[PDB]
């Protein structure tokens, strides 16, 4: 085309991404100083302006990127993310939900989607999640079953920790982290239900024994592959 | 046969397992809402009925499965488990042991034995336990020896933590998890027995150094096997 | 010889080790019941007798084993251990050091030296220690340097935690375990010395980063060996 | 040359390093006794003298080493370190910064730079840091983004923990270590902001899931290399 390809050469240019990566870091320092109320009393409106500027520059950048990339933009996770963290940044501060004014900061994660060094890492870390979804399901069911049981056993005399399935979910996650599991939870529990240890010591055993085997499988299974991709390139040459 | 093979085609069918997996998830949501007393005041008897229904459907399912599978049912762990978690579900609520009304929830673990994706994981995780039984024994003896020693050294001035072999077992397990081992246990201990650190710092060292080597062996030993199953398939082809 | 070889066939026999392994387990149950004062009020002297019996049986067993094994007994760690844990068991209860009456229990560790299944594990776990001694030295020096620094920085306003090199050693080990390192130690420290985080956050970083690399090296280095013992058996056959 | 090569043979000699390694250990014991005020009341000035001696001996040693090694001394990290930890040791005790009198102890780290066994380890541990710098950056950005968010969400009602970006940095690091993350931080937070768990449970998930994959990558990636350096030496011989 003509106007399309004129835009495309700008969007796909190094200066464009450099300019965005530039603005991202500039806004990043802006949001960190925005925490200090000394700075907000002094250089206050300077940054609300400079924030409102970058938001529209990012909307323009997203609009241009949509015209260039067409359906592929809405099938790219890094683009879909960039879309949503600016869409969040666009909903005005006026609402009965001031938490969206805090979700503004997620637009600093653009420095991941914009810098290909970070994307490579983030992709590598996420790439382990697919196989773990099956083990994640077993653990989530395990948690749900014990959270039912704990709510029924302990939620009566211990409402804060167990009086509700959601609380027992939180508390059991705290037991998984071993955070004050004994002194803070099980030992007070045992002052009323002496056999509560029969519930939690196995829970700590299963939960831990799975987390370990999850990591062990991640290592040993990833490397039977390299031990067969080598087992193949060696039989390649003797034939 | 005739009536046997008529049953077998039903039990071994996809609809049968699908229908059980269906009921399992339905009962799973039932038990989670059963925790809320708002729901139990409203839709209360709806779920006691629907529970009593699924229990008999499961007994029928187990009865049918026993007639089909014969001795192999009572030699299959997944079947033996399904047997016991429904047998637990059958003992009536009337007893001086209301904990069996809570063990009802273990029938949600049927979703493991019924969904072959989960069974594959559970089998993989359990498959590491066999070799660990030898190291588990050494640790359990190590614990027993120190639990004797700790009960004799500290159980006098510190009954809650050490006044009994069982308590010293629990406390030493808490020291293994490092849960408040210093601020909560050893530091108060040292206010009376200044050399208590001579007992626990080595205990933390041995217990940790074994747990690490247990995991390291799980990895390195699992993969000398893949490094010899490859060492074999390479000598295969040069001869 | 004549009387020598008559003894040797007994000592080296299966019944002899079986009889010792038997007595060890019997004494093991004895010491566990010896903790209960209900049992000691009832079956009390029964076990002091039965203990005094096993001690001499073990001395006889050690004496016989010394005559058979000659200098090799005092060059065998399992024998040297069996020697010392019975020698400890022989020093009479009368002393201004009643802790030796508790070290009696270490004679339950004979079940390790007597059962070859356990010895194999204990040997495997200890076999990692040799290479770690070099990294252990660096960490022990690292601890000593910071324990000097912490005693000088914090031992004034905080004697319990840091008022002495030994206490700073203990406290720093507690920081290594992350046991209440922030809420219990560094946060109170920062109420007086606001930059104490500059001391401990790096200490947590170095200490952790070494522990991880210690384990990583244990795995990756153990398995370049299996990756070259295979690299050798493959070049073996193509020549 | 003449005077140059006369110095060089001394500096590069075994006695020279031995004499320094000697003095280092001697000063190491000196600084440990210097903590005891009983010792400082008695043998006090003995060690201030002996310290002032070793400092100049080390300056001489550094001066000689600079004349020998020329530009290579100021391009060697072990030398650059030895330079700085003695330069720190030279700034006189008189200042409004008595912390430099504590940084004297870093001259005990010379025993690392002087003993080639330690240098080999320290080099091996540091050698993992290069590849981790990319993942370290992602985590440091992740921390910065959430530390902004936490300061804005919680710093109002919770100034000690979150009232400042620096405090939220410290607190989030404490949550990463799981040190009292629930009982000490999130549970008090939830007494005011009930959905604070929506902030921290994911933070614990991401932070942990990265730390694990960081270690897993360190292992699995280090050993595709040994699995291709072997994959190469095997194709070497079949051609
Ligand atoms: C998108 C990527 C962008 C990357 C940008 C990286 C650099 C960001 C720098 C931001 C600096 C913000 C400093 C700031 O707000 O300081 C707040 C507080 C001081 O609060 P304040 O109320 O001013 O103190 C008043 C003191 N008084 C009473 C004596 C008048 O003081 C503090 O909180 C202490 C200073 C904390 C600095 C934390 C720096 C974190 C760097 C993270 C780098 C990540 C790179 C990926
Ligand atoms: C490998 C490791 C696998 C771990 C799997 C289990 C993870 C469990 C995480 C803990 C969840 C948790 O915090 O539970 C609390 C929530 C909220 O309940 P709520 O009733 O709001 O009570 C919160 C506490 N309160 C009353 C004091 C405000 O409780 C709920 O409402 C439960 C919500 C669902 C929890 C599980 C969701 C899926 C987790 C898996 C994530 C996979 C990521 C790829
Ligand atoms: C066999 C497999 C079956 C899988 C089924 C998965 C889905 C199960 C859903 C169960 C939902 C149960 C909800 C429930 O009971 O909520 C209890 C509490 C509310 O208690 P409630 O007393 O009603 O609150 C009264 C409030 N008031 C005063 C204003 C009137 O509120 C809470 O506790 C908050 C909601 C917690 C939801 C936790 C969801 C966990 C999902 C785990 C999924 C595992 C998949 C394998
Ligand atoms: C790899 C890791 C290997 C770890 C091996 C050691 C595991 C030790 C686990 C801790 C056991 C524990 O909780 O001890 C407490 C129990 C009950 O004593 P009890 O007198 O009821 O006192 C409980 C506390 N109280 C008084 C406040 C109610 O104390 C006892 O009565 C002791 C019961 C036997 C404990 C050991 C049983 C075998 C554990 C190994 C499991 C292998 C799974 C395949
Ligand atoms: C050399 C290898 C030998 C291996 C031997 C393994 C078996 C050892 C069994 C020892 C059993 C000792 C039982 C015992 O002393 O119990 C103490 C306490 C009860 O104290 P007590 O003062 O009698 O309670 C009075 C109750 N009252 C007021 C109602 C009258 O009750 C408790 O503490 C509860 C029971 C704790 C049992 C712990 C069992 C640990 C097994 C470890 C196995 C390791 C195998 C390698
Ligand atoms: C891989 C991991 C490597 C770790 C290396 C560092 C380990 C440090 C362990 C912590 C030592 C410790 O508990 O320090 C306390 C002792 C006793 O000092 P003390 O003055 O009695 O104060 C104790 C506390 N108090 C006053 C309340 C009674 O403080 C001292 O007196 C220090 C004694 C020497 C400590 C280091 C000994 C070598 C440890 C390495 C073990 C290798 C095993 C193969
Ligand atoms: C460059 C490498 C050099 C390596 C040198 C290794 C050896 C260093 C030995 C230093 C010994 C220092 C002993 C010391 O200052 O003890 C301080 C305190 C006692 O304080 P003090 O105020 O004398 O107690 C008075 C008692 N009263 C009231 C009854 C009169 O008592 C304690 O703190 C207890 C003793 C703690 C000893 C800690 C030993 C750590 C060894 C680390 C080895 C690392 C090797 C790389
Ligand atoms: C793999 C693991 C990667 C982990 C990456 C994140 C590490 C974060 C470490 C925590 C930092 C920290 O302690 O934050 C506190 C500082 C000082 O703030 P400050 O305002 O002084 O408040 C301190 C607390 N107070 C008010 C009670 C005295 O807060 C600040 O001022 C922030 C200073 C920058 C923090 C990050 C610096 C780079 C860390 C990466 C190190 C790489 C080593 C190769
Ligand atoms: C075996 C266990 C549990 C499932 C099970 O046991 N069944 C699962 C859970 C996590 C899975 C790995 C990760 O996904 C990362 C990676 C993705 C590649 O694509 C294939 C290789 C690798 C190493 C996967 C292998 C395997 O699938 C793992 C170990
Ligand atoms: C060597 C140590 C301790 C025993 C000892 O050192 N002796 C033991 C404890 C756990 C054992 C592994 C697990 O069982 C899983 C798996 C089962 C396979 O069947 C064979 C391979 C593998 C990897 C086992 C190898 C080895 O047996 C291990 C590492
Ligand atoms: C060759 C087979 C036979 C038994 C297998 C192991 C066991 O299955 C236990 C465990 C399951 C995890 O999933 C992955 C890790 C581990 C150690 C397996 C590794 C490997 O696959 C082995 C050695
Ligand atoms: C490389 C690091 C640190 C020393 C250093 O980096 N130099 C050291 C510390 C622990 C050492 C291992 C253990 O000893 C166990 C085992 C003993 C065998 O005999 C040889 C193989 C193996 C795996 C050792 C290799 C290597 O020696 C390790 C990893
Ligand atoms: C893959 C991940 C993350 C980066 C990413 O995913 N991209 C990064 C972070 C740490 C990196 C390793 C360490 O540096 C140590 C060592 C240095 C050698 O030189 C090359 C090999 C090795 C094992 C490195 C491989 C790889 O680079 C790692 C695993
Ligand atoms: C082939 C060489 C070149 C760089 C080496 C790695 C680095 O040295 C860092 C680290 C040191 C530990 O000691 C052992 C683990 C690790 C990851 C090494 C493994 C291996 O040796 C590598 C990949």
Author numbering:
A (entry chain A), B (entry chain A), C (entry chain A), D (entry chain A): 999 to 1237
Provide text from the study.
pmcVoltage-gated sodium (NaV) channels initiate and propagate action potentials in nerves and muscles, and mutations in NaV channels lead to many diseases of hyperexcitability. Structural studies of the homotetrameric bacterial sodium channel NaVAb showed that these four homologous domains come together to form a functional channel with an ion-conducting pore at its center. To overcome these limitations, we introduced these IEM mutations into NaVAb, a bacterial ancestor of mammalian NaV channels, confirmed their functional effects in negatively shifting the voltage dependence of channel activation, and determined their structures at high resolution by X-ray crystallography. All of these structures have their VSs in the activated state, as determined by the outward position of the gating charges in the S4 segment, while the PM is closed at the activation gate formed by the intracellular ends of the S6 segments.
Electrophysiological recordings of NaVAb/V126T showed a shift of −12 mV in Va, similar to the shift of −8.4 mV for NaV1.7/S241T. These results indicate that NaVAb/V126T is a valid structural model for this IEM mutation. The crystal structure of NaVAb/V126T at 3.1-Å resolution suggests that the V126T side chain forms a long-range hydrogen bond with the side chain of the Asn211′ residue in the S6 segment of a neighboring subunit. The V126T side chain rotates almost 180° from the Val side chain in the WT structure, twisting around the axis of the Cα–Cβ bond to reorient the oxygen atom toward the Asn211′ side chain with a distance of ~3.4 Å while maintaining van der Waals interaction with the side chain of Ile216 on S6. In the WT structure, Val126 interacts with Asn211′ through van der Waals interactions with a distance of ~4 Å. The V126T mutation changes the chemistry of the interaction to a hydrogen bond while preserving the volume of the side chain and the hydrophobic interaction with Ile216. The hydrogen bond between Val126T and Asn211, which is absent in the resting-state homology model (Fig. 5D and (17)), likely enhances activation by providing additional stability to the activated state and thereby leads to channel hyperexcitability. Similarly, the nearby residue NaV1.7/S241T is predicted to form a lower energy hydrogen bond with Asn950 in DII S6 of NaV1.7. Mutations NaVAb/I119T and NaVAb/V126T give two-component Boltzmann fits of their activation curves, as if the voltage sensor activates in two steps. Remarkably, the biphasic activation curves were resolved to approximately single Boltzmann fits with this protocol, confirming that biphasic activation curves were caused by the short times available to reach peak current in the standard G/V curve protocol.
